Point group: C3
Chain length 179, copies 3
Protein backbone atom coordinates (compact mmCIF):
# COMPACT_ATOMS: atom_id res chain seq x y z
CA UNK A 1 0.00 0.00 0.00
CA UNK A 2 1.24 3.48 -0.92
CA UNK A 3 0.54 5.82 1.99
CA UNK A 4 0.09 9.38 0.73
CA UNK A 5 -2.97 10.52 2.67
CA UNK A 6 -3.86 11.18 6.29
CA UNK A 7 -7.14 9.73 7.50
CA UNK A 8 -7.99 10.05 11.18
CA UNK A 9 -11.30 8.62 12.35
CA UNK A 10 -12.57 9.11 15.94
CA UNK A 11 -10.07 7.69 18.43
CA UNK A 12 -11.59 8.79 21.73
CA UNK A 13 -14.74 8.71 23.84
CA UNK A 14 -15.23 12.25 25.21
CA UNK A 15 -16.97 10.70 28.22
CA UNK A 16 -13.76 8.91 29.20
CA UNK A 17 -11.07 11.19 27.82
CA UNK A 18 -8.95 8.26 26.66
CA UNK A 19 -7.43 8.35 23.18
CA UNK A 20 -6.58 5.11 21.38
CA UNK A 21 -20.13 4.67 10.60
CA UNK A 22 -18.18 7.71 11.80
CA UNK A 23 -15.04 6.88 9.83
CA UNK A 24 -13.17 9.74 8.18
CA UNK A 25 -12.45 9.43 4.47
CA UNK A 26 -9.35 10.76 2.70
CA UNK A 27 -10.06 9.79 -0.92
CA UNK A 28 -7.56 12.00 -2.68
CA UNK A 29 -3.83 11.50 -3.09
CA UNK A 30 -2.08 13.56 -0.40
CA UNK A 31 -5.47 14.48 1.08
CA UNK A 32 -6.20 14.87 4.79
CA UNK A 33 -9.47 13.97 6.53
CA UNK A 34 -9.76 14.26 10.31
CA UNK A 35 -12.88 13.85 12.43
CA UNK A 36 -16.16 11.96 12.59
CA UNK A 37 -17.40 11.38 9.00
CA UNK A 38 -14.99 14.01 7.65
CA UNK A 39 -14.23 13.64 3.93
CA UNK A 40 -11.53 15.06 1.66
CA UNK A 41 -12.68 13.85 -1.77
CA UNK A 42 -9.97 14.92 -4.19
CA UNK A 43 -6.27 15.57 -4.62
CA UNK A 44 -4.56 17.26 -1.67
CA UNK A 45 -7.89 18.41 -0.21
CA UNK A 46 -8.10 18.99 3.56
CA UNK A 47 -11.14 18.37 5.75
CA UNK A 48 -10.99 18.77 9.52
CA UNK A 49 -14.14 18.67 11.63
CA UNK A 50 -17.14 16.44 12.19
CA UNK A 51 -19.09 16.13 8.96
CA UNK A 52 -16.68 18.46 7.17
CA UNK A 53 -16.49 18.10 3.39
CA UNK A 54 -13.78 19.18 0.95
CA UNK A 55 -15.10 18.17 -2.48
CA UNK A 56 -12.67 20.10 -4.67
CA UNK A 57 -9.10 19.54 -5.77
CA UNK A 58 -6.87 21.41 -3.30
CA UNK A 59 -9.91 22.59 -1.32
CA UNK A 60 -9.79 23.19 2.43
CA UNK A 61 -12.70 22.87 4.86
CA UNK A 62 -12.32 23.16 8.63
CA UNK A 63 -15.12 23.23 11.15
CA UNK A 64 -18.11 20.98 11.88
CA UNK A 65 -20.33 20.68 8.78
CA UNK A 66 -18.01 23.04 6.88
CA UNK A 67 -17.98 22.44 3.13
CA UNK A 68 -15.63 23.52 0.36
CA UNK A 69 -17.73 22.66 -2.70
CA UNK A 70 -15.35 23.44 -5.54
CA UNK A 71 -11.71 23.32 -6.54
CA UNK A 72 -9.42 25.49 -4.41
CA UNK A 73 -12.31 26.68 -2.22
CA UNK A 74 -11.50 27.43 1.41
CA UNK A 75 -13.97 27.42 4.29
CA UNK A 76 -13.37 27.97 8.00
CA UNK A 77 -16.09 27.71 10.62
CA UNK A 78 -19.16 25.71 11.58
CA UNK A 79 -21.52 25.28 8.62
CA UNK A 80 -19.42 27.59 6.45
CA UNK A 81 -19.77 27.06 2.68
CA UNK A 82 -17.72 28.09 -0.34
CA UNK A 83 -18.00 27.39 -4.05
CA UNK A 84 -15.03 27.07 -6.42
CA UNK A 85 -12.16 29.50 -5.75
CA UNK A 86 -14.13 31.09 -2.93
CA UNK A 87 -13.31 32.06 0.65
CA UNK A 88 -15.83 31.70 3.50
CA UNK A 89 -14.61 32.49 7.02
CA UNK A 90 -16.92 32.36 10.03
CA UNK A 91 -19.77 30.16 11.19
CA UNK A 92 -22.54 30.09 8.55
CA UNK A 93 -20.43 32.21 6.19
CA UNK A 94 -21.30 31.46 2.57
CA UNK A 95 -19.82 32.48 -0.76
CA UNK A 96 -20.54 31.87 -4.40
CA UNK A 97 -17.75 31.20 -6.90
CA UNK A 98 -14.60 33.30 -6.56
CA UNK A 99 -16.15 35.35 -3.78
CA UNK A 100 -15.16 36.29 -0.24
CA UNK A 101 -17.38 36.07 2.82
CA UNK A 102 -15.95 36.87 6.25
CA UNK A 103 -18.16 37.06 9.32
CA UNK A 104 -20.90 35.10 11.04
CA UNK A 105 -23.69 34.51 8.52
CA UNK A 106 -21.96 36.66 5.89
CA UNK A 107 -23.22 36.00 2.36
CA UNK A 108 -21.37 36.74 -0.89
CA UNK A 109 -24.17 35.48 -3.14
CA UNK A 110 -23.02 37.16 -6.34
CA UNK A 111 -20.05 35.53 -8.03
CA UNK A 112 -16.82 37.40 -7.27
CA UNK A 113 -18.59 39.44 -4.57
CA UNK A 114 -17.19 40.37 -1.15
CA UNK A 115 -19.15 40.42 2.10
CA UNK A 116 -17.28 41.38 5.28
CA UNK A 117 -19.11 41.57 8.59
CA UNK A 118 -21.85 39.80 10.52
CA UNK A 119 -24.80 39.16 8.21
CA UNK A 120 -23.25 41.31 5.48
CA UNK A 121 -24.89 40.48 2.17
CA UNK A 122 -24.28 40.95 -1.54
CA UNK A 123 -27.38 39.73 -3.38
CA UNK A 124 -26.84 37.32 -6.27
CA UNK A 125 -27.79 39.97 -8.85
CA UNK A 126 -25.29 42.55 -7.60
CA UNK A 127 -22.31 41.55 -9.70
CA UNK A 128 -18.80 42.39 -8.54
CA UNK A 129 -20.10 44.27 -5.50
CA UNK A 130 -18.94 44.55 -1.89
CA UNK A 131 -20.77 44.87 1.43
CA UNK A 132 -18.74 46.12 4.41
CA UNK A 133 -19.95 46.11 8.01
CA UNK A 134 -22.49 44.50 10.31
CA UNK A 135 -25.66 43.82 8.30
CA UNK A 136 -24.42 45.87 5.35
CA UNK A 137 -26.25 45.01 2.15
CA UNK A 138 -25.69 46.04 -1.44
CA UNK A 139 -28.57 47.52 -3.43
CA UNK A 140 -27.01 47.42 -6.90
CA UNK A 141 -24.24 45.88 -9.01
CA UNK A 142 -20.73 47.35 -9.32
CA UNK A 143 -20.97 48.93 -5.88
CA UNK A 144 -19.62 49.05 -2.35
CA UNK A 145 -22.18 49.32 0.44
CA UNK A 146 -21.27 50.43 3.95
CA UNK A 147 -24.80 50.23 5.33
CA UNK A 148 -28.34 48.94 4.93
CA UNK A 149 -32.05 49.82 5.01
CA UNK A 150 -31.91 51.15 8.57
CA UNK A 151 -28.32 52.35 8.78
CA UNK A 152 -26.10 54.72 6.84
CA UNK A 153 -22.52 55.05 8.03
CA UNK A 154 -20.19 58.03 7.86
CA UNK A 155 -16.81 57.49 6.19
CA UNK A 156 -13.93 59.04 8.12
CA UNK A 157 -10.24 59.91 7.80
CA UNK A 158 -10.64 60.58 4.08
CA UNK A 159 -7.91 62.67 2.44
CA UNK A 160 -9.13 65.13 -0.20
CA UNK A 161 -9.52 63.63 -3.65
CA UNK A 162 -7.37 64.78 -6.56
CA UNK A 163 -8.28 62.64 -9.58
CA UNK A 164 -11.77 62.82 -11.09
CA UNK A 165 -12.78 59.46 -9.62
CA UNK A 166 -11.42 60.15 -6.13
CA UNK A 167 -13.80 60.66 -3.20
CA UNK A 168 -14.46 64.16 -1.87
CA UNK A 169 -14.33 65.14 1.81
CA UNK A 170 -16.20 67.88 3.67
CA UNK A 171 -13.29 70.35 3.75
CA UNK A 172 -12.92 69.93 -0.01
CA UNK A 173 -16.63 70.52 -0.63
CA UNK A 174 -16.55 73.73 1.40
CA UNK A 175 -13.33 74.97 -0.19
CA UNK A 176 -14.48 74.45 -3.78
CA UNK A 177 -17.80 76.15 -3.06
CA UNK A 178 -16.19 79.13 -1.33
CA UNK A 179 -14.14 79.77 -4.46
Amino acid sequence: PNLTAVQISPNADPALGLEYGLNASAKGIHSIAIGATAEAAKGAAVAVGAGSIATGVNSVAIGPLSKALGDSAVTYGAASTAQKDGVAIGARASTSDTGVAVGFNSKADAKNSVAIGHSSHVAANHGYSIAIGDRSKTDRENSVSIGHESLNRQLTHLAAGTKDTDAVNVAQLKKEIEK
Copy 2:
Protein backbone atom coordinates in the same frame (compact mmCIF):
# COMPACT_ATOMS: atom_id res chain seq x y z
CA PRO B 1 -16.49 2.95 24.49
CA ASN B 2 -18.20 5.06 21.83
CA LEU B 3 -15.53 6.81 19.77
CA THR B 4 -16.90 10.07 18.36
CA ALA B 5 -14.04 12.48 19.03
CA VAL B 6 -10.46 12.90 17.86
CA GLN B 7 -7.88 13.55 20.57
CA ILE B 8 -4.24 13.68 19.56
CA SER B 9 -1.68 14.36 22.28
CA PRO B 10 2.04 14.90 21.51
CA ASN B 11 3.46 11.87 19.71
CA ALA B 12 6.95 13.08 18.83
CA ASP B 13 10.14 14.55 20.26
CA PRO B 14 11.19 17.37 17.88
CA ALA B 15 14.79 16.70 18.91
CA LEU B 16 14.60 13.20 17.43
CA GLY B 17 12.01 13.59 14.68
CA LEU B 18 10.43 10.22 15.47
CA GLU B 19 6.65 9.97 15.69
CA TYR B 20 5.03 7.24 17.79
CA GLY B 21 0.70 16.92 31.47
CA LEU B 22 0.67 17.91 27.80
CA ASN B 23 -2.29 15.71 26.89
CA ALA B 24 -4.85 17.08 24.46
CA SER B 25 -8.48 17.04 25.56
CA ALA B 26 -11.48 16.50 23.27
CA LYS B 27 -14.38 16.80 25.73
CA GLY B 28 -17.23 17.31 23.31
CA ILE B 29 -19.03 14.74 21.20
CA HIS B 30 -17.52 14.83 17.71
CA SER B 31 -14.92 17.34 18.91
CA ILE B 32 -11.29 17.45 17.77
CA ALA B 33 -8.30 18.43 19.92
CA ILE B 34 -4.78 18.18 18.51
CA GLY B 35 -1.55 19.38 20.11
CA ALA B 36 0.11 19.86 23.48
CA THR B 37 -2.60 20.77 26.05
CA ALA B 38 -5.08 21.59 23.28
CA GLU B 39 -8.72 21.48 24.39
CA ALA B 40 -12.03 21.35 22.51
CA ALA B 41 -14.55 21.68 25.35
CA LYS B 42 -17.96 21.30 23.73
CA GLY B 43 -19.90 19.65 20.94
CA ALA B 44 -18.09 19.43 17.61
CA ALA B 45 -15.55 22.08 18.64
CA VAL B 46 -12.11 22.02 17.00
CA ALA B 47 -8.83 22.99 18.65
CA VAL B 48 -5.50 22.57 16.88
CA GLY B 49 -2.32 24.03 18.31
CA ALA B 50 -0.36 24.02 21.54
CA GLY B 51 -2.48 25.50 24.30
CA SER B 52 -5.33 26.17 21.88
CA ILE B 53 -8.81 26.42 23.41
CA ALA B 54 -12.23 26.03 21.79
CA THR B 55 -14.71 26.63 24.62
CA GLY B 56 -17.89 27.04 22.58
CA VAL B 57 -20.25 24.65 20.88
CA ASN B 58 -19.10 24.33 17.26
CA SER B 59 -16.22 26.74 17.87
CA VAL B 60 -12.92 26.50 16.00
CA ALA B 61 -9.51 27.59 17.29
CA ILE B 62 -6.27 26.94 15.42
CA GLY B 63 -2.86 28.26 16.35
CA PRO B 64 -0.75 28.19 19.53
CA LEU B 65 -2.65 29.82 22.41
CA SER B 66 -5.57 30.58 20.07
CA LYS B 67 -8.92 30.74 21.85
CA ALA B 68 -12.50 30.64 20.61
CA LEU B 69 -14.35 31.75 23.75
CA GLY B 70 -17.97 31.41 22.70
CA ASP B 71 -20.33 29.29 20.64
CA SER B 72 -19.55 29.24 16.92
CA ALA B 73 -16.54 31.53 17.35
CA VAL B 74 -13.64 31.01 14.95
CA THR B 75 -10.02 31.99 15.57
CA TYR B 76 -6.95 31.43 13.42
CA GLY B 77 -3.45 32.42 14.45
CA ALA B 78 -1.13 32.55 17.45
CA ALA B 79 -2.83 34.14 20.46
CA SER B 80 -5.90 35.05 18.41
CA THR B 81 -9.12 35.50 20.40
CA ALA B 82 -12.81 35.57 19.49
CA GLN B 83 -16.00 35.83 21.52
CA LYS B 84 -19.30 34.20 20.57
CA ASP B 85 -20.11 34.24 16.84
CA GLY B 86 -16.94 36.18 16.15
CA VAL B 87 -14.12 35.84 13.63
CA ALA B 88 -10.47 36.58 14.51
CA ILE B 89 -7.84 35.87 11.85
CA GLY B 90 -4.17 36.65 12.38
CA ALA B 91 -1.73 36.46 15.27
CA ARG B 92 -3.01 38.52 18.21
CA ALA B 93 -6.24 39.30 16.34
CA SER B 94 -9.10 39.86 18.79
CA THR B 95 -12.83 40.33 18.39
CA SER B 96 -15.80 40.92 20.64
CA ASP B 97 -19.11 39.13 20.08
CA THR B 98 -20.29 38.81 16.48
CA GLY B 99 -17.37 40.87 15.23
CA VAL B 100 -14.65 40.40 12.63
CA ALA B 101 -10.95 41.04 13.14
CA VAL B 102 -8.49 40.22 10.36
CA GLY B 103 -4.84 41.18 10.60
CA PHE B 104 -1.96 41.01 13.05
CA ASN B 105 -3.07 42.66 16.30
CA SER B 106 -6.39 43.74 14.76
CA LYS B 107 -9.03 44.60 17.38
CA ALA B 108 -12.80 44.61 16.88
CA ASP B 109 -13.60 45.70 20.44
CA ALA B 110 -17.15 46.86 19.82
CA LYS B 111 -19.69 44.09 19.41
CA ASN B 112 -20.50 43.47 15.74
CA SER B 113 -17.57 45.66 14.68
CA VAL B 114 -15.12 44.96 11.85
CA ALA B 115 -11.38 45.62 11.94
CA ILE B 116 -9.34 44.70 8.85
CA GLY B 117 -5.62 45.38 8.75
CA HIS B 118 -2.57 45.34 11.00
CA SER B 119 -3.42 47.01 14.31
CA SER B 120 -6.76 48.21 12.95
CA HIS B 121 -9.03 49.13 15.84
CA VAL B 122 -12.70 49.75 16.53
CA ALA B 123 -13.00 50.99 20.11
CA ALA B 124 -15.58 49.28 22.33
CA ASN B 125 -17.84 52.36 22.33
CA HIS B 126 -17.98 52.64 18.53
CA GLY B 127 -20.98 50.43 17.89
CA TYR B 128 -21.42 48.76 14.51
CA SER B 129 -18.34 50.49 13.10
CA ILE B 130 -15.55 49.40 10.76
CA ALA B 131 -11.83 50.18 10.57
CA ILE B 132 -10.07 49.42 7.27
CA GLY B 133 -6.32 49.53 6.74
CA ASP B 134 -3.03 49.41 8.62
CA ARG B 135 -3.51 51.14 11.99
CA SER B 136 -6.92 52.49 10.98
CA LYS B 137 -9.00 53.48 13.98
CA THR B 138 -12.60 54.55 14.32
CA ASP B 139 -13.43 57.78 16.15
CA ARG B 140 -17.20 57.35 16.45
CA GLU B 141 -20.05 54.85 16.28
CA ASN B 142 -21.90 53.93 13.07
CA SER B 143 -18.86 54.71 10.96
CA VAL B 144 -16.19 53.39 8.62
CA SER B 145 -12.66 54.67 9.16
CA ILE B 146 -9.96 54.39 6.53
CA GLY B 147 -7.27 56.12 8.56
CA HIS B 148 -6.07 57.32 11.95
CA GLU B 149 -4.61 60.23 13.93
CA SER B 150 -1.57 60.58 11.67
CA LEU B 151 -2.95 59.31 8.37
CA ASN B 152 -5.87 60.14 6.11
CA ARG B 153 -6.26 58.03 2.99
CA GLN B 154 -7.67 58.98 -0.39
CA LEU B 155 -10.48 56.81 -1.76
CA THR B 156 -10.05 55.94 -5.44
CA HIS B 157 -11.92 54.45 -8.39
CA LEU B 158 -15.22 55.85 -7.13
CA ALA B 159 -18.03 56.11 -9.67
CA ALA B 160 -20.22 59.21 -9.36
CA GLY B 161 -23.03 58.87 -6.85
CA THR B 162 -26.67 58.97 -7.94
CA LYS B 163 -28.81 58.37 -4.85
CA ASP B 164 -28.81 60.87 -1.98
CA THR B 165 -26.70 58.61 0.23
CA ASP B 166 -24.14 57.73 -2.46
CA ALA B 167 -20.58 59.06 -2.23
CA VAL B 168 -19.50 61.97 -4.45
CA ASN B 169 -16.31 62.01 -6.53
CA VAL B 170 -14.17 64.96 -7.65
CA ALA B 171 -15.54 65.11 -11.21
CA GLN B 172 -19.06 65.21 -9.78
CA LEU B 173 -18.20 68.01 -7.35
CA LYS B 174 -16.74 70.12 -10.15
CA LYS B 175 -19.62 69.41 -12.54
CA GLU B 176 -22.37 70.31 -10.06
CA ILE B 177 -20.57 73.51 -9.10
CA GLU B 178 -19.96 74.57 -12.70
CA LYS B 179 -23.71 74.37 -13.32
Copy 3:
Protein backbone atom coordinates in the same frame (compact mmCIF):
# COMPACT_ATOMS: atom_id res chain seq x y z
CA PRO C 1 12.07 11.00 24.77
CA ASN C 2 10.10 14.14 25.65
CA LEU C 3 6.97 14.24 23.51
CA THR C 4 5.87 17.85 22.97
CA ALA C 5 5.07 17.88 19.26
CA VAL C 6 2.52 16.25 16.97
CA GLN C 7 3.88 14.74 13.77
CA ILE C 8 1.49 12.81 11.56
CA SER C 9 2.87 11.34 8.34
CA PRO C 10 0.61 9.65 5.74
CA ASN C 11 -1.25 6.73 7.31
CA ALA C 12 -3.58 5.71 4.49
CA ASP C 13 -3.73 4.70 0.85
CA PRO C 14 -6.62 6.66 -0.72
CA ALA C 15 -7.06 3.79 -3.18
CA LEU C 16 -7.94 1.43 -0.33
CA GLY C 17 -9.45 3.77 2.26
CA LEU C 18 -7.72 1.97 5.13
CA GLU C 19 -5.98 4.02 7.81
CA TYR C 20 -3.12 2.51 9.82
CA GLY C 21 9.99 10.32 1.65
CA LEU C 22 6.55 11.74 2.44
CA ASN C 23 7.16 11.96 6.19
CA ALA C 24 5.82 15.00 8.03
CA SER C 25 8.28 16.97 10.14
CA ALA C 26 7.45 18.75 13.41
CA LYS C 27 10.82 20.31 14.30
CA GLY C 28 9.70 22.85 16.86
CA ILE C 29 8.79 22.29 20.49
CA HIS C 30 4.99 22.04 20.71
CA SER C 31 4.77 22.22 16.91
CA ILE C 32 2.27 20.31 14.78
CA ALA C 33 2.92 18.90 11.30
CA ILE C 34 0.26 16.83 9.56
CA GLY C 35 0.29 15.54 5.98
CA ALA C 36 2.63 14.33 3.26
CA THR C 37 5.95 16.24 3.59
CA ALA C 38 4.34 18.85 5.85
CA GLU C 39 6.82 20.77 8.01
CA ALA C 40 6.45 22.99 11.08
CA ALA C 41 10.00 24.28 11.54
CA LYS C 42 9.93 26.31 14.74
CA GLY C 43 8.36 26.68 18.15
CA ALA C 44 4.63 25.98 18.30
CA ALA C 45 4.25 26.34 14.52
CA VAL C 46 1.39 24.50 12.81
CA ALA C 47 1.47 22.99 9.32
CA VAL C 48 -1.43 20.95 7.96
CA GLY C 49 -1.56 19.93 4.32
CA ALA C 50 0.60 18.18 1.75
CA GLY C 51 3.79 20.15 1.26
CA SER C 52 2.66 22.80 3.73
CA ILE C 53 5.41 24.83 5.39
CA ALA C 54 5.35 26.88 8.60
CA THR C 55 8.85 28.35 8.87
CA GLY C 56 8.23 30.94 11.58
CA VAL C 57 7.89 30.79 15.33
CA ASN C 58 4.17 30.47 16.11
CA SER C 59 3.31 30.51 12.40
CA VAL C 60 0.31 28.64 10.98
CA ALA C 61 0.00 27.22 7.46
CA ILE C 62 -2.93 25.07 6.34
CA GLY C 63 -3.59 23.88 2.82
CA PRO C 64 -1.54 22.02 0.21
CA LEU C 65 1.66 23.94 -0.58
CA SER C 66 0.62 26.69 1.85
CA LYS C 67 3.56 28.54 3.39
CA ALA C 68 3.88 30.83 6.39
CA LEU C 69 7.35 32.28 5.79
CA GLY C 70 7.88 34.37 8.90
CA ASP C 71 7.19 34.50 12.61
CA SER C 72 3.49 34.63 13.51
CA ALA C 73 2.42 34.51 9.86
CA VAL C 74 -0.86 32.77 9.09
CA THR C 75 -1.85 31.25 5.76
CA TYR C 76 -4.98 29.33 4.80
CA GLY C 77 -5.54 27.81 1.38
CA ALA C 78 -3.76 26.00 -1.43
CA ALA C 79 -0.52 27.75 -2.39
CA SER C 80 -1.26 30.66 -0.05
CA THR C 81 1.80 32.61 1.14
CA ALA C 82 2.44 35.04 3.98
CA GLN C 83 5.53 36.83 5.25
CA LYS C 84 6.17 37.71 8.89
CA ASP C 85 3.10 38.87 10.84
CA GLY C 86 0.98 38.59 7.71
CA VAL C 87 -2.40 37.04 6.94
CA ALA C 88 -3.14 35.28 3.63
CA ILE C 89 -6.53 33.59 3.26
CA GLY C 90 -7.61 31.89 0.05
CA ALA C 91 -5.94 29.77 -2.61
CA ARG C 92 -2.97 31.65 -4.11
CA ALA C 93 -3.47 34.53 -1.66
CA SER C 94 -0.16 36.27 -0.96
CA THR C 95 0.92 38.96 1.47
CA SER C 96 4.09 40.82 2.30
CA ASP C 97 5.10 41.52 5.90
CA THR C 98 2.34 42.60 8.28
CA GLY C 99 -0.20 42.65 5.47
CA VAL C 100 -3.60 41.09 4.87
CA ALA C 101 -4.69 39.27 1.72
CA VAL C 102 -8.11 37.62 1.59
CA GLY C 103 -9.46 36.12 -1.61
CA PHE C 104 -8.37 33.83 -4.42
CA ASN C 105 -5.15 35.24 -5.91
CA SER C 106 -5.34 38.35 -3.70
CA LYS C 107 -2.00 40.15 -3.40
CA ALA C 108 -0.94 42.53 -0.61
CA ASP C 109 2.49 43.25 -2.09
CA ALA C 110 3.23 46.41 -0.13
CA LYS C 111 4.18 45.85 3.50
CA ASN C 112 1.23 46.48 5.83
CA SER C 113 -1.15 46.59 2.85
CA VAL C 114 -4.63 45.06 2.67
CA ALA C 115 -6.12 43.30 -0.35
CA ILE C 116 -9.64 41.88 -0.02
CA GLY C 117 -11.30 40.18 -2.97
CA HIS C 118 -10.47 37.92 -5.90
CA SER C 119 -7.30 39.18 -7.59
CA SER C 120 -7.33 42.36 -5.52
CA HIS C 121 -3.90 43.95 -5.61
CA VAL C 122 -1.87 46.53 -3.73
CA ALA C 123 1.37 47.06 -5.64
CA ALA C 124 4.61 46.91 -3.65
CA ASN C 125 5.17 50.67 -3.99
CA HIS C 126 1.75 51.63 -2.63
CA GLY C 127 2.61 51.82 1.04
CA TYR C 128 -0.11 51.37 3.66
CA SER C 129 -2.81 51.10 1.00
CA ILE C 130 -5.93 48.96 0.64
CA ALA C 131 -7.69 47.36 -2.33
CA ILE C 132 -11.31 46.27 -1.83
CA GLY C 133 -13.30 44.18 -4.29
CA ASP C 134 -12.90 41.78 -7.19
CA ARG C 135 -9.83 42.84 -9.20
CA SER C 136 -9.54 46.13 -7.31
CA LYS C 137 -6.08 47.63 -7.62
CA THR C 138 -4.44 50.59 -5.93
CA ASP C 139 -2.81 53.29 -8.04
CA ARG C 140 -0.98 55.18 -5.29
CA GLU C 141 0.29 54.98 -1.71
CA ASN C 142 -1.79 55.93 1.35
CA SER C 143 -5.02 55.06 -0.44
CA VAL C 144 -8.07 52.83 -0.57
CA SER C 145 -9.13 51.60 -4.00
CA ILE C 146 -12.58 50.19 -4.70
CA GLY C 147 -11.99 49.58 -8.39
CA HIS C 148 -9.53 49.21 -11.24
CA GLU C 149 -8.63 50.26 -14.80
CA SER C 150 -11.94 49.08 -16.25
CA LEU C 151 -14.25 49.48 -13.26
CA ASN C 152 -15.23 52.28 -10.91
CA ARG C 153 -17.68 51.40 -8.16
CA GLN C 154 -20.29 53.57 -6.49
CA LEU C 155 -20.17 53.81 -2.70
CA THR C 156 -23.60 53.51 -1.06
CA HIS C 157 -25.37 53.98 2.27
CA LEU C 158 -23.05 56.84 3.20
CA ALA C 159 -24.28 59.18 5.94
CA ALA C 160 -23.45 62.86 5.41
CA GLY C 161 -20.01 63.87 6.61
CA THR C 162 -19.56 66.32 9.47
CA LYS C 163 -15.82 66.62 10.15
CA ASP C 164 -13.49 68.08 7.52
CA THR C 165 -12.07 64.67 6.63
CA ASP C 166 -15.44 62.90 6.42
CA ALA C 167 -16.81 61.74 3.06
CA VAL C 168 -19.58 63.73 1.36
CA ASN C 169 -22.76 62.20 -0.08
CA VAL C 170 -24.95 63.39 -2.96
CA ALA C 171 -27.66 64.95 -0.76
CA GLN C 172 -24.97 66.90 1.07
CA LEU C 173 -23.41 68.15 -2.17
CA LYS C 174 -26.77 69.39 -3.42
CA LYS C 175 -27.72 70.98 -0.10
CA GLU C 176 -24.46 72.92 0.31
CA ILE C 177 -24.66 74.17 -3.28
CA GLU C 178 -28.30 75.24 -2.98
CA LYS C 179 -27.34 77.45 -0.04
